[PDB]
Design an enzyme around this catalytic site. Structure first.
Site, PDB file in Angstrom:
ATOM      1  N   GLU A  88       0.794  -1.219   0.000  1.00 49.01           N
ATOM      2  CA  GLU A  88       0.000   0.000   0.000  1.00 49.01           C
ATOM      3  C   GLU A  88       0.818   1.256   0.000  1.00 49.01           C
ATOM      4  O   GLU A  88       0.279   2.318  -0.298  1.00 49.01           O
ATOM      5  CB  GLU A  88      -0.969   0.043   1.238  1.00 49.01           C
ATOM      6  CG  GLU A  88      -1.910  -1.196   1.317  1.00 49.01           C
ATOM      7  CD  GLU A  88      -3.031  -1.128   0.271  1.00 49.01           C
ATOM      8  OE1 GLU A  88      -3.798  -2.038   0.045  1.00 49.01           O
ATOM      9  OE2 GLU A  88      -3.068   0.015  -0.395  1.00 49.01           O
ATOM     10  N   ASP A  95      -6.505   6.358  -5.100  1.00 51.80           N
ATOM     11  CA  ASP A  95      -6.399   4.897  -5.257  1.00 51.80           C
ATOM     12  C   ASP A  95      -5.992   4.506  -6.646  1.00 51.80           C
ATOM     13  O   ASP A  95      -6.159   5.281  -7.586  1.00 51.80           O
ATOM     14  CB  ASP A  95      -7.856   4.300  -5.302  1.00 51.80           C
ATOM     15  CG  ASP A  95      -7.984   3.421  -4.167  1.00 51.80           C
ATOM     16  OD1 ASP A  95      -9.026   2.901  -3.865  1.00 51.80           O
ATOM     17  OD2 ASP A  95      -6.863   3.285  -3.509  1.00 51.80           O
ATOM     18  N   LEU A 107      -8.855   3.990   2.605  1.00 56.81           N
ATOM     19  CA  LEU A 107      -9.876   4.550   1.730  1.00 56.81           C
ATOM     20  C   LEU A 107     -10.748   5.547   2.460  1.00 56.81           C
ATOM     21  O   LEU A 107     -11.286   5.246   3.535  1.00 56.81           O
ATOM     22  CB  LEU A 107     -10.706   3.470   1.038  1.00 56.81           C
ATOM     23  CG  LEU A 107     -11.927   4.068   0.313  1.00 56.81           C
ATOM     24  CD1 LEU A 107     -11.496   4.722  -1.019  1.00 56.81           C
ATOM     25  CD2 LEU A 107     -12.932   2.932   0.090  1.00 56.81           C
ATOM     26  N   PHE A 156      -8.234  -6.739   2.968  1.00 54.06           N
ATOM     27  CA  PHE A 156      -7.853  -5.331   3.127  1.00 54.06           C
ATOM     28  C   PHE A 156      -8.040  -4.542   1.816  1.00 54.06           C
ATOM     29  O   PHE A 156      -8.598  -3.430   1.790  1.00 54.06           O
ATOM     30  CB  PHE A 156      -6.407  -5.237   3.538  1.00 54.06           C
ATOM     31  CG  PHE A 156      -6.010  -3.834   3.918  1.00 54.06           C
ATOM     32  CD1 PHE A 156      -5.608  -2.946   2.929  1.00 54.06           C
ATOM     33  CD2 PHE A 156      -5.913  -3.443   5.253  1.00 54.06           C
ATOM     34  CE1 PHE A 156      -5.142  -1.678   3.267  1.00 54.06           C
ATOM     35  CE2 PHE A 156      -5.478  -2.166   5.615  1.00 54.06           C
ATOM     36  CZ  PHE A 156      -5.107  -1.280   4.601  1.00 54.06           C
ATOM     37  N   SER A 205     -11.847 -20.347  -5.612  1.00 54.94           N
ATOM     38  CA  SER A 205     -10.511 -20.141  -5.057  1.00 54.94           C
ATOM     39  C   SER A 205     -10.462 -20.507  -3.574  1.00 54.94           C
ATOM     40  O   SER A 205      -9.562 -21.219  -3.124  1.00 54.94           O
ATOM     41  CB  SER A 205      -9.977 -18.739  -5.244  1.00 54.94           C
ATOM     42  OG  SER A 205      -9.803 -18.459  -6.635  1.00 54.94           O
ATOM     43  N   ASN A 260      -6.475 -20.409 -10.210  1.00 54.06           N
ATOM     44  CA  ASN A 260      -7.812 -19.866 -10.162  1.00 54.06           C
ATOM     45  C   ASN A 260      -7.866 -18.355  -9.747  1.00 54.06           C
ATOM     46  O   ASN A 260      -8.655 -17.544 -10.281  1.00 54.06           O
ATOM     47  CB  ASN A 260      -8.638 -20.662  -9.150  1.00 54.06           C
ATOM     48  CG  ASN A 260     -10.090 -20.293  -9.250  1.00 54.06           C
ATOM     49  OD1 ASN A 260     -10.661 -19.519  -8.439  1.00 54.06           O
ATOM     50  ND2 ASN A 260     -10.643 -20.684 -10.381  1.00 54.06           N
TER      51      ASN A 260
END
Length: 162
Positions: A11, A20, A32, A104, A117, A132
């Site tokens: 991040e 973003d 965010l 996250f 998955s 996948n």
């Protein structure tokens, strides 16, 4: 390496409001603020988050504080989710970190939808799962990051973050 270091790598850390990869107002370590187009809206959320009139800028400590809350929230999300919890509980620590990272990034709901998955993960079919996982908008929009997390699920090691 741990979930905090891992997310901090993925991040980054920015002390001023930024946009973003999706174009949404964010600050700190991937915190965010709002999906709203309004900068003022974002500043408002920021001030509410921090508890002061920031005018779009925060300190490193403040960023880490939001970060810690965010990490905590991701775990908490997982634990509460009927699709996520069983997977999480089945995984080793490193792989748990990868799942927290995804949540996250895309939220509890987004991740809980990767049904196939998640199942492969639970089955410990690492290579299959990794295959996948890449068949997603996630992977195509943030391939380098996705590759790192996938690698982490595949190997159960932190090699991608070394």
């Amino acid at each position: 390496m741990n979930i905090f270091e891992m997310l901090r790598i993925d991040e980054g850390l920015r002390l001023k409001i930024y946009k973003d990869t999706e174009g949404y107002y964010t600050i700190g370590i991937g915190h965010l603020l709002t999906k709203s187009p309004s900068l003022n809206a974002a500043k408002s959320e920021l001030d509410k988050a921090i508890g002061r009139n920031t005018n779009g800028v925060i300190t490193k400590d403040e960023a880490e504080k939001l970060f810690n809350q965010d990490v905590d929230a991701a775990v908490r999300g997982i634990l509460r989710n009927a699709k996520l919890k069983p997977v999480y509980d089945s995984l080793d620590a490193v792989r748990r970190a990868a799942l927290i990272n995804m949540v996250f990034q895309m939220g509890e709901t987004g991740v809980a939808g990767f049904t196939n998955s998640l199942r492969m993960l639970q089955q410990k079919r690492w290579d299959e799962a990794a295959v996948n996982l890449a068949k997603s908008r996630w992977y195509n929009q943030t391939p380098n990051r996705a590759k790192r997390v996938i690698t982490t699920f595949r190997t159960g090691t932190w090699d991608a973050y070394k």
